[PDB]
Ligand binder design. Structure first.
Ligand SMILES: Nc1nc2c(ncn2[C@@H]2O[C@H](COP(=O)(O)OP(=O)(O)OP(=O)(O)O)[C@@H](O)[C@H]2O)c(=O)[nH]1
Ligand SMILES: Nc1nc2c(ncn2[C@@H]2O[C@H](COP(=O)(O)OP(=O)(O)O)[C@@H](O)[C@H]2O)c(=O)[nH]1
Ligand SMILES: COc1ccc(N(C)c2cc(=O)oc3ccccc23)cc1N
Ligand SMILES: [Ca+2]
Ligand SMILES: [Mg+2]
Ligand SMILES: [Mg+2]
Lengths: 54, 334, 437, 428
C-alpha cells in the first residue's frame, strides 16, 4: 500500500511500493594455473613423441 | 506408442495403472531414468518437478501436483485452514486444531483449553488420545517430532449393531485441467470394538484405520462397509440417504480444500501437466455432521475397487492427454 | 556520468551484441555511421547515453564495446555489416582457430595466448573513461570460447579493476538450438570459475526464447536472428536506466543492491511482456494490468521455472511506454490477491518500479509489433535454481562415465576441476534450498 | 581451422578418392580444368577447406595422390577430372606392394614415404590454419593399408596437434582379392585405433549387399561400390564444405562424436539409395528420408544397429525442405526408439541442414553413427584372422619382409580389446 521515493523527470518516473515489512586470486596464482596446464600439455605431447620414436 | 516411467515401487494404485497401460499395447514402459517419457508415475518424496517439461517433442504429464503436500501433511493442513480466507478459523467442518513443536501456538492452545475447563464441556483432545493437557505436552517433547493437537470428536455416529466407530474414505482425482472428480464408491473403515466414552486407555475401540484392527472382520469383510450398505442402513435406522445426510457435506469440503490451493498448484499455463489422486478422510458425528480428518496424497484403494478406480485413472487423467487408437466419477462443479 | 564497457565473447556474445547495439542506435537516434543529429554538444559530453557511447571531434558516437572471438567469421560479419563504421577496428578482436566447443581449450590453450591483447584493448577503452563503473559481459555458457575465454577474462578483470562492477548476460544451453553435446560440461565449468567474479548475472535459456518466438511470434523454426532481436529487447529494458535520465538502477552498484542481497545467489529471473507478432493484422493493445499480470506467467519468463514454489528476495518492474504509477499500484494490488507471491522472511514484500515514457523501439521490418506499453520484471527468486538442477543432472549423467572428459584433460585441465566445479554447483543448489523452503 | 589436406593411397584409395573429387567439384561448380562455373555463392564461401586459389582464378584442391604402383594413378590422370590435380602431388613408386601390409609399412613404403611427406609439408605451409588431414585407403591391400598407416604415424609425429580423419574400406570375402585381407586389415585397425581421431568404416560387405539386394545389380563392380562411397563421402563432409548454422570442422566433429578416444569408428549411412545412371523421379517425404537413413539397409558398415546402442549420431539433410518437419521427424526417431540411444549422453543426436542437394536428387539424408554395434565388423575380421593365424597360414609373405609373429599377436589383442570396450558401453 505505501508508496515511497517518488522521483519524476521529463523521461519518466520511479518509485517503490511496499506491501508488507520484513521479519580473489592474484595475477600470480592465475599465471601459475595457466602455466601448470601448458606443462601438462607439453608432457603429454613429449610422451607421444617418445612413443612415436620407439 | 506413448512412453512412461515408474518411480514408486510401493504404490498399489500405480502398479495396477501401469499394468493397465501395457495391456492396451499403446504404452511402452521405459527404464526408471530415461528422460524421454510422456508420463511419469513419480516417487513419493523429492520428485524432481524441475526436470519436467523441458523435452522437445514430448508432452509430459506427472501423477502428482507440486505443492499438494500443503493439504496432505497434518501440520501444514491446520496452517492452511487457519490462514486462508477461503476456509478461515471460522470454518465449520474442520475440528479445532493447534500446531505444537518439541523444541508454534502452545500458549494459544491451552487458552481455549480453559474454556473447556471453566464452562466445562468435553475436554478430550487427540495429538494419541488424552483428557489432560499436561500429559499431551509431555508426549510431544518425549518423541521429538512436530505434531498437531486436535479436538477429539466425543459424540461420533455409532453403527448398530455393535456400538461402533468409523471413518469415511473418499477418493478424489484432480486432472490436468483441474476438474475435480469424486469416485462414486467410498469406503467406511469401521471399528469392531464397541465405543467407550469413559476409557481412553484404549486403541482398537477408538482408532479406525484398517491396520490397528488386524473382534476383526465380524460384521463385514475386513472392517469395510461399502456405500450401498451404508445408505441402506441410513434409510432403515435414521430415515435418510447417504447423498443427503453426508455426501453433500463431503462434496462441499473436497471442493473447498481443492479450490483453495488451485492458484498455488494448477498446471494450466505450465510447461508440464499434473494430475493427482487424493484420499480424503471423514468423521461423522451423531447429528450427521461431517468433519474432515486428513487428506492423503498417496493413498491405497480398497481391494474390491482397485480395478474400477485404476481404469478411471487411465480414462480421465491419462487418455484425456494421450488418446488411444457410464462414468464412475461425480464431477464437482465450480 | 559514469561509463560502462560492454564485452561480447564468442559467437553468442557477439551476435547478441550486434543486436543490442543496433537497438541502442535506434533508441538514441544514432545512425550506422555514428552521427547523432540530436546531440548538441559536438565532440564530448556527459549525458546519460555517454555511459555507452564515446564521441570523436567529428561527432562520431562510438560504442564502449569490445568484441572478442577465437575464430574470425562471426566478427568478420560485424566488420563488413550495416554497423561497420560504428566500431573502431581495434575494438573487434579475433583469433584464427576457435575453442572447438571445449572450455579447456578456450580457457587454457587458446586463451593464454590472446588474453593480454584483449586486456590491452580493454585498457584502451578504460583510459578514455572519466569514472569507469565497470563491465557488461555477454557470452554463451555452452560454447568453448563463451565459457572458457569468458571465465579467464572475468578472473583477470577482477585483478586489474578490483573495484569495478561486472554484470553478465549469459545464454543457457537448450537442445533445440545447441551446437555441442558437451554444453553441460562447459556451463558447469564456466559457472564455477566465474561465480566469485560476477556481481549480477542475467541468464537467458534459449529454450524459453525459442518457445516465445514460436508461440507469440508464430515463427515455426526460430533462427538466431529471431532469438537475438527478442533478447536485445530484454537487455535494452535492463540497461535503459543506465542510458536514460532516471532515479532507479542508475549505476551498476545499484543492480546488486536492488537485486542481490546474497552475493552467490546473483541470478535474477527476467520476465518480459508483451511479445506480439508484427504480422498480427488485428491486435488489441494490452493495459498496464494485463502486461503486469503477464510477468507472473512462466511462459513469459527468460527461464522456464515456477516462482510459486520458491521465495522472492527482490523485484523490479521496468516499464516502457504509456504507464503511470497509479495504474501500476492498482495492477499490483489485484495481482497480489490472485497469485502466490511469497518473499523470504528477512526482505520487505515489495516492488521497485521504473518507468520510461518512450515505448519500446522495434527494429524496422523485424518480428515484433510496436506496442503502447511494455514491462520487464527482474525478480530474484529461488525458483531459478530449477535451471541449475536440470543442468547439474545432465552433467552427472555424462560425468559418471567420464564421457568426453579426455578432450578436456588433453588440453591440460585436471580431471579434479570437474568434480570441484560440480561441488560448487552442489553447494549453490543447496544455498537456494536453504533460502527458499 | 580452415584447410584440410586430403591424401589418397593405393588402388582403392585413389579410385574412391578420384570419385570424391569428381562429386564435390560438381557440387562447388568447379570444372575439370579448375574454373568455377556455378551460380550460387554458397558454392564458394568455404571452398578454401578443400580447393585452393591458384593462378588465373583457378582452384587446386589440396589433394596428394600416393601409390607404390603407377597403374591406378595413370588411370586417375586420364580419368574425367584428372587434369584438376596438381602434377607435383602425384607421388608414386614402381614396385607395388603385392597386397602385403609389411611391404607398404616396412619395406617398399618406407622407401617412398619421405617423398610423400615433402608434398604434405608443401601443402601445409600454404595453410592459414590447417585443421588436419583426411585419408582415403582400403585396409585389405598393401599400399593403402600398410603405407597408408605408416603415413598416418609419420603425419602424427610432425603434426601432433592436427586432426586425423580416414575413410577406411574394410575387406569382405564377398568382394575379395586375396586371402591375406584379414591380416592386412587387423594390422591396420591396430594403427587406426591409436593414430586417428575419426574413421569412417566403409564396409565392402555392406556396399555389395546394397548393390545386390537394394539396387538390384546382379553383378556389382567396384565402380558400383564406389558410387555409394562417393555419395556417402559427399554427404559426410557437407558441414565442412558449406556455410550453415554449425560452421563445422574436423575437431568439433571429433569432440562431439567421440566420448572415449579409442571409440572413433563411425557407421555412415545414406538415403535415398540410388544406382549409377538409373534414378527415380519421386522425391522422398521428410518422414521417408528419416526412416530410410536410420534403416540398417542404408548403412555402409554391415552391422545391425539394433545389436547395439548409439553413443552419438550426426545427421545431415540436404535439399529444400521444412526444417520444422526435420526436427519433428528426428525427435520422433529418438522418442520412438529411445532404448537404442545411450541415456547417459543427453541429446546425443544432432541434425544439420544444407539447401544445396547432391547431383540428381532433390532431397537427401546422410547418417554418421557412433554405434557400439560396430563391434560386429571387428569381430568378423577377428574371426577371419584367427582362422588363418592359428595355423600360421600365409605368414611367410610377412616374415619374409622382416616381421615377427608377435606383431600379429599384438594387433589381434588390441582389436579384441577394442571389441570388448564397445561391449562395455553397450551394457553400462
Ligand atoms: N541466443 C543465441 N544463442 C546462440 C547464438 N549463437 C550461439 N548460441 C548458443 O551458444 C551455444 C554455443 O556457443 P557459441 O557461443 O556458438 O560458441 P563460442 O563461444 O563461439 O565457442 P566455440 O565456437 O566453441 O569456440 C549454444 O547453446 C548456442 O545455441 C546466438 O546468436 N543467439
Ligand atoms: N570399395 C572399393 N574397394 C576396393 C577398390 N579397389 C580395391 N578394393 C578393395 O581393397 C582391397 C585391396 O586393396 P587395394 O587398394 O587394391 O590394394 P593397394 O593398392 O595395395 O592399397 C580389397 O579389400 C578390395 O576389395 C575400389 O575401387 N572400391
Ligand atoms: C552428437 O552431437 C554432435 C555431433 C556432431 C556435431 N558436429 C560438430 C558436426 C560436424 C560435422 O562435420 O558434421 C555434422 C553433421 C550433422 C550434425 C553435426 C555435425 C555436433 C554435435 N552436437
Ligand atoms: Ca555530446
Ligand atoms: Mg565460435
Ligand atoms: Mg588391388
Amino acid at each position: 500500500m505505501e508508496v515511497i521515493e517518488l522521483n519524476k523527470c521529463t523521461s519518466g518516473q520511479s518509485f517503490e511500493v511496499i506491501l508488507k515489512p520484513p521479519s580473489d586470486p592474484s595475477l600470480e596464482e592465475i599465471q601459475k594455473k595457466l602455466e601448470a596446464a601448458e606443462e601438462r600439455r607439453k608432457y603429454q605431447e613429449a610422451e607421444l613423441l617418445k612413443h612415436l620414436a620407439e | 506408442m506413448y512412453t512412461f516411467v515408474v518411480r514408486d515401487e510401493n504404490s498399489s494404485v500405480y502398479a495396477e495403472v501401469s499394468r493397465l497401460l501395457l495391456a492396451t499395447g499403446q504404452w511402452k514402459r521405459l527404464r526408471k531414468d530415461n528422460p524421454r517419457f510422456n508420463l511419469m508415475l513419480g516417487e513419493r518424496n523429492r520428485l524432481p518437478f524441475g526436470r519436467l517439461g523441458h523435452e522437445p517433442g514430448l508432452v509430459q504429464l506427472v501423477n502428482y501436483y507440486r505443492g499438494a503436500d500443503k493439504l496432505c501433511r497434518k501440520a501444514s493442513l491446520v496452517k492452511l485452514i487457519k490462514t486462508s480466507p477461503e476456509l478461515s478459523e471460522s470454518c465449520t467442518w474442520f475440528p479445532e486444531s493447534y500446531v505444537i513443536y518439541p523444541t508454534d501456538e502452545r500458549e494459544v492452545f491451552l487458552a481455549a483449553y480453559n474454556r473447556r475447563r471453566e464452562g466445562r464441556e468435553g475436554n478430550v483432545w487427540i495429538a494419541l488420545i488424552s483428557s489432560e493437557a499436561s500429559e499431551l505436552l509431555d508426549f510431544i517433547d518425549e518423541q521429538g517430532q512436530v505434531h498437531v493437537i486436535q479436538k477429539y470428536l466425543e459424540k461420533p455416529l455409532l453403527l448398530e449393531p455393535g456400538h461402533r466407530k468409523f471413518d469415511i474414505r473418499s477418493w478424489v482425482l484432480v486432472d490436468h485441467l483441474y476438474n475435480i472428480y469424486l469416485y462414486r464408491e467410498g469406503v467406511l473403515r469401521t471399528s469392531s470394538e464397541p465405543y467407550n466414552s469413559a476409557n481412553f486407555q484404549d486403541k482398537t475401540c477408538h482408532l479406525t484405520n484398517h491396520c490397528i484392527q488386524k473382534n476383526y472382520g465380524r460384521y463385514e469383510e475386513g472392517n469395510e462397509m461399502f456405500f450401498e450398505e451404508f445408505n441402506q442402513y441410513l434409510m432403515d435406522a435414521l430415515n435418510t440417504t447417504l447423498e443427503n445426510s453426508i455426501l453433500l457435506q463431503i462434496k462441499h469440503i473436497i471442493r473447498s480444500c481443492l479450490m483453495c490451493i488451485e492458484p498455488a498448484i494448477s498446471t494450466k499455463h505450465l510447461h508440464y501437466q499434473s494430475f493427482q489422486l487424493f484420499g480424503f478422510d471423514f468423521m461423522v458425528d451423531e447429528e450427521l455432521k461431517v468433519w474432515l480428518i486428513e487428506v492423503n496424497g498417496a493413498p491405497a484403494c480398497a481391494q474390491k475397487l482397485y480395478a474400477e478406480l485404476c481404469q478411471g485413472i487411465v480414462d480421465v487423467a491419462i487418455s484425456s492427454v494421450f488418446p488411444l487408437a457410464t462414468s464412475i466419477f461425480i464431477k464437482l462443479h465450480h | 556520468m559514469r561509463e560502462c564497457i560492454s564485452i561480447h565473447v564468442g559467437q553468442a556474445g557477439v551476435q547478441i551484441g550486434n543486436a543490442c547495439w543496433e537497438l541502442y542506435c535506434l533508441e538514441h537516434g544514432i545512425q550506422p555511421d555514428g552521427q547523432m543529429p540530436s546531440d548538441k554538444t559536438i565532440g564530448g559530453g556527459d549525458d546519460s547515453f555517454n555511459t555507452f557511447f564515446s564521441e570523436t571531434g567529428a561527432g562520431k558516437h562510438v560504442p564502449r564495446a569490445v568484441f572478442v572471438d577465437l575464430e574470425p567469421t562471426v566478427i568478420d560479419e560485424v566488420r563488413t555489416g550495416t554497423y561497420r563504421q560504428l566500431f573502431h577496428p581495434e575494438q573487434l578482436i579475433t583469433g584464427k582457430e576457435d575453442a572447438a566447443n571445449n572450455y579447456a581449450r578456450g580457457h587454457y590453450t587458446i586463451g593464454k595466448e590472446i588474453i593480454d591483447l584483449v586486456l590491452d584493448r580493454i585498457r584502451k577503452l578504460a583510459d578514455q573513461c572519466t569514472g569507469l563503473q565497470g563491465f557488461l559481459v555477454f557470452h554463451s555458457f555452452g560454447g568453448g570460447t563463451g565459457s572458457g575465454f569468458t571465465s579467464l577474462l572475468m578472473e583477470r578483470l577482477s585483478v586489474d579493476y578490483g573495484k569495478k562492477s561486472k554484470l553478465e548476460f549469459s545464454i543457457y544451453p537448450a537442445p533445440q538450438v545447441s551446437t555441442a553435446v558437451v554444453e553441460p560440461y562447459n556451463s558447469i565449468l564456466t559457472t564455477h570459475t566465474t561465480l566469485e567474479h560476477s556481481d549480477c548475472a542475467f541468464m537467458v535459456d534459449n529454450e524459453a526464447i525459442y518457445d516465445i518466438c514460436r508461440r507469440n511470434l508464430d515463427i515455426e523454426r526460430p533462427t538466431y536472428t529471431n532469438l537475438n532481436r527478442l533478447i536485445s529487447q530484454i537487455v535494452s529494458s535492463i540497461t535503459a536506466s543506465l542510458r536514460f535520465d532516471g532515479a532507479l538502477n542508475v549505476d551498476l552498484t545499484e543492480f546488486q543492491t536492488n537485486l542481490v542481497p546474497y552475493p552467490r545467489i546473483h541470478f535474477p529471473l527476467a520476465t518480459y511482456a508483451p511479445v506480439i507478432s508484427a504480422e498480427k493484422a488485428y491486435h488489441e493493445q494490452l493495459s498496464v494490468a494485463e502486461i503486469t499480470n503477464a510477468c507472473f506467467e512462466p511462459a513469459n519468463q527468460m527461464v522456464k521455472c515456477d516462482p510459486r514454489h520458491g521465495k522472492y528476495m527482490a523485484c523490479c518492474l521496468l516499464y516502457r511506454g504509456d504507464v503511470v504509477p497509479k495504474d501500476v499500484n492498482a495492477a499490483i494490488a489485484t495481482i497480489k490477491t490472485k497469485r502466490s507471491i511469497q518473499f523470504v522472511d528477512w526482505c520487505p514484500t515489495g516492488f521497485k518500479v521504473g518507468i520510461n515514457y518512450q515505448p519500446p523501439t522495434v527494429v524496422p521490418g523485424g518480428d515484433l509489433a510496436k506496442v503502447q506499453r511494455a514491462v520487464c520484471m527482474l525478480s530474484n527468486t529461488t525458483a531459478i535454481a530449477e535451471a541449475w538442477a536440470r543442468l547439474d543432472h545432465k552433467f552427472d549423467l555424462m560425468y559418471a562415465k567420464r564421457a568426453f572428459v579426455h578432450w578436456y584433460v588433453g588440453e591440460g585441465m585436471e580431471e579434479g576441476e570437474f568434480s570441484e566445479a560440480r561441488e560448487d554447483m552442489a553447494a549453490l543448489e543447496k544455498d537456494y534450498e536453504e533460502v527458499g523452503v | 581451422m580452415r584447410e584440410i589436406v586430403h591424401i589418397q593411397a593405393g588402388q582403392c584409395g585413389n579410385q574412391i578418392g578420384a570419385k570424391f573429387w569428381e562429386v564435390i567439384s560438381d557440387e562447388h561448380g568447379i570444372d575439370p580444368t579448375g574454373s568455377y562455373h556455378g551460380d550460387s555463392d554458397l558454392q564458394l564461401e568455404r571452398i578454401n577447406v578443400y580447393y585452393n586459389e591458384a593462378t588465373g582464378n583457378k582452384y587446386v584442391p589440396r589433394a596428394i595422390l600416393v601409390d607404390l604402383e603407377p597403374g591406378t594413378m595413370d588411370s586417375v590422370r586420364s580419368g574425367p577430372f584428372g587434369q584438376i590435380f596438381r602434377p607435383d602431388n602425384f607421388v608414386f613408386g614402381q614396385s607395388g606392394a603385392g597386397n602385403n601390409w609389411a611391404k607398404g609399412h616396412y619395406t617398399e613404403g618406407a622407401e617412398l614415404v619421405d617423398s610423400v611427406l615433402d608434398v604434405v609439408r608443401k601443402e601445409s605451409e600454404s595453410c592459414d590454419c590447417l585443421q588436419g588431414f583426411q585419408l582415403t585407403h582400403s585396409l585389405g591391400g598393401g599400399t593403402g593399408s600398410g603405407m597408408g598407416t605408416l603415413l598416418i604415424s609419420k603425419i602424427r609425429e610432425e603434426y601432433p596437434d592436427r586432426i586425423m580423419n580416414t575413410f577406411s574400406v574394410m575387406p569382405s570375402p564377398k568382394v575379395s582379392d586375396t586371402v591375406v585381407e584379414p591380416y592386412n586389415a587387423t594390422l591396420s585397425v591396430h594403427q587406426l585405433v591409436e593414430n586417428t581421431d575419426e574413421t569412417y568404416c566403409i564396409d565392402n560387405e555392406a556396399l555389395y549387399d546394397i548393390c545386390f539386394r537394394t539396387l538390384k545389380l546382379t553383378t556389382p563392380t567396384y565402380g558400383d561400390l564406389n558410387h555409394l562411397v562417393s555419395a556417402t563421402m559427399s554427404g559426410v563432409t557437407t558441414c565442412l564444405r558449406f556455410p550453415g548454422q554449425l560452421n563445422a570442422d574436423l575437431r568439433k566433429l571429433a569432440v562431439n562424436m567421440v566420448p572415449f578416444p579409442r571409440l572413433h569408428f563411425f557407421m555412415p549411412g545414406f538415403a535415398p539409395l540410388t544406382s549409377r545412371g538409373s534414378q527415380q523421379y519421386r522425391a522422398l517425404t521428410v518422414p521417408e528420408l528419416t526412416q530410410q537413413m536410420f534403416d540398417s539397409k542404408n548403412m555402409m558398415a554391415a552391422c545391425d544397429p539394433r545389436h547395439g546402442r548409439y553413443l552419438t549420431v550426426a545427421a545431415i539433410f540436404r535439399g529444400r525442405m521444412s526444417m520444422k518437419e526435420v526436427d519433428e521427424q528426428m525427435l520422433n526417431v529418438q522418442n520412438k526408439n529411445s532404448s537404442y540411444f545411450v541415456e547417459w549422453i543427453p541429446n546425443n543426436v544432432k541434425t544439420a541442414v544444407c539447401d544445396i542437394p547432391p547431383r540428381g536428387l532433390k532431397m537427401s539424408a546422410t547418417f554418421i553413427g557412433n554405434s557400439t554395434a560396430i563391434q560386429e565388423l571387428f569381430k568378423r575380421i577377428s574371426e577371419q584372422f584367427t582362422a588363418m593365424f592359428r595355423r600360421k597360414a600365409f605368414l611367410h609373405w610377412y616374415t619374409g619382409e622382416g616381421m615377427d609373429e608377435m606383431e600379429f599377436t599384438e594387433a589381434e589383442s588390441n582389436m579384441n580389446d577394442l571389441v570388448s570396450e564397445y561391449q562395455q558401453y553397450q551394457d553400462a
